[PDB]
Amino acid sequence: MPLVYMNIIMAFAIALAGLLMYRSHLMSSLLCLEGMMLSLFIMSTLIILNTHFTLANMMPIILLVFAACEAALGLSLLVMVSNTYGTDYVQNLNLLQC
Amino acid sequence: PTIRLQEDPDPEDENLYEKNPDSHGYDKDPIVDLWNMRVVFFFGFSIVLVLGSTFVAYLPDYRMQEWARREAERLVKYREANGLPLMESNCFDPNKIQLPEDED
């Protein structure tokens, strides 16, 4: 693979790692989710352009659509959590245990 | 209330002899109890015990004890007269056995 492929894969890994380790704000983790979506878009677009697969040029648009759906879902859940606690801290979501 | 719960008291045990001086210990109802006694006695002692013991005593000899005794008598008679040994150490004829060629 070229260097650009490794760079995009590294960006995906960094965004995943970012999502895995929570600080305080929920919104930061949502941003990491969007970052993973962007990295996947870039990687798929590069692969499809390189191989000249004409009918596959439309998949990244579908990916963006479902990324938007996912982001809207997350934002709605954040609105509800904030309305409950007045803060979007993940520390407050501790009513249910294992 | 200094209590912990609402519960019935533990009742005393009933004596079946109080309402039925000849009670047989099967039921509180005298008629049902008497017939329970009767069916238990008839179907346990009269039917299963005695008749089953007779049936087992007169079972036909499927174990073939007497057949084996008569066969052994025939064999002993035949072998004694001929001068043959009463019994043989090998129960299988060696002509039908093939030992391995080499023992070294």
Partner: protein, 55 residues
């Protein structure tokens, strides 16, 4: 000494003690997504190297 104590001690009481201790260890989590998402990260990293690097 034997029937009421040691035969009890070795087979059933040891089993009960071990199962209860492991149940306490496994089931007592605070329910904070931070901790077990960090656990997920550790699992993912171990998995690529331990089982993925060897194909």
């Amino acid at each position: 000494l034997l029937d009421l104590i040691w035969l009890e001690t070795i087979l059933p009481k040891t089993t009960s003690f071990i199962q209860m201790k492991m149940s306490i260890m496994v089931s007592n989590q605070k329910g904070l997504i931070k901790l077990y998402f960090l656990s997920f990260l550790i699992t993912i990293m171990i998995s690529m190297t331990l089982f993925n690097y060897h194909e």
